[PDB]
Amino acid sequence: ANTYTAEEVVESGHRFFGSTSGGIASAVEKAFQSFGLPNGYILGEEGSGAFIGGLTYGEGTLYTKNAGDHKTFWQGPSLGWDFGGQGSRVMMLVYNLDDIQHLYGRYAGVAGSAYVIAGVGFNVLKRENIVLVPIRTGIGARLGVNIGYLKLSAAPTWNPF
Amino acid sequence: ANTYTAEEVVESGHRFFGSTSGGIASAVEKAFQSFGLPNGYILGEEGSGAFIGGLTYGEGTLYTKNAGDHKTFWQGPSLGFGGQGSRVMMLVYNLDDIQHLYGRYAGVAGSAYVIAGVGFNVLKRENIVLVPIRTGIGARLGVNIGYLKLSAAPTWNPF
Ligand SMILES: [Cl-]
Ligand SMILES: [Cl-]
Known part of the structure; x- marks a missing residue:
């Protein structure tokens, strides 16, 4: 009852990405089939x-069913999918979040x-027993699967380590 | 009696790529679901x-059931590069006359x-459909390339 279903996730993604494209449902249906039900998501x-494409700085909110919602910031290497001045949108599924404070740190x-x-x-990033699945569209769909590192923080930071 | 089966292409995939990776069986399925039965494949x-990752030069053989097997060369952009190069398996759809294979694919x-x-990913020239399958680094990077020229003799020129 602390988990999200694929249908709730597909709806949040359809609305956040402004897309009814079948790819969203396909990708969500793939993540669940591989990892089960998440107990949080980040939009x-x-x-x-700032680093001319080579470092990504992100900002969003973590949504849970009974642990409240939280501003989340992140840093990582980029190929420039977010090099657009308005940036680009990402939905991350979060599996096995037991306690909000365990979210922050470095994901491999x-x-x-x-x-x-x-x-x-x-693609999939793991820290301790937390699996992180960043779902991207368009350019990011193709280029983001190349990130192998992401840091998550409670406050915005220049420093990705 | 001209098209290949999914199982045929998968076994060719396992053998050429040197992998029983389940992704081979999985990719060939999707290409067969989206496109049906190819009547050629290039290994x-x-x-x-030579162009430091700025331009790919490829070489292989197109295999068919009746038209024979024909040396094939291709040129296109690259995202990079290793010394041994990297393998590709190209599914070919709607190949009637071998001479209609060559030229620029978008x-x-x-x-x-x-x-x-x-x-x-998928590129096309007239009604022929080309599906270049790669593994590893080429699986992720190759799907960004939206141009390929196929030719009967090698050339430095990609246009
Ligand atoms: Cl976007
Ligand atoms: Cl885009």
Whole structure:
């Protein structure tokens, strides 16, 4: 009862990405089939312009069913999908969040976890027992599956380590 | 009696890529679901070290059931590069006359598919459809390339 269903997730993504494209449902249906039901999700925006495409700074909100909601910031290497001045949107599924404070830290990518279908892509990052699945669209769908590192923080920071 | 089966292409995929990676069986399925039965496949190798990753030069063989097997070369952009180069398996759809294979192929937007270390996208020239399948780094990066020229003899010129 602390988990989200694929249907709730597909709806949040349809609304956040402004897309009814079948790729969103396909990618969500793939993440759940591989990892089960998340107990949180992050909607936010990323931009890489400050480091001219090579570092991504993101900002969004963590949504849970009974642990409240929280501003979340993140930093990582970028290929420039978010090099657009308005940045680009990302929805991350969060699995196994037991306590909000355990969310912050450094996430290591899982090799061969890239998945792309119909203009929607994700990969998998893990820290301790938390799995993180950043779902991106468009350019980010294809380029974001190359990030193997993401840091999550409670406050915005320039420092990605 | 001209098209290949999904199982046929998968076994060719396992053998050429040297992998029983389930992503091979998974990618070929999606290409067969989206596109049906191809009547050719190209096995070959790529390299972008001469243009430092700025341009790929490829070489292989197109295999058919009746038209014979024909040396094939391709040129296109690259995202980079290793010394040995990297392997590719190209599904060919709607290949009537071998001579209609050669020329410039334009990518299909949003056609990229990537699963378990395997990936393709789709490019087209007239009614022929080309699906270049790669593994590893090429699975992720190759799906960004939306141009390929196929030719009967090698050339430095990509246009
Ligand atoms: Cl976006
Ligand atoms: Cl885009």
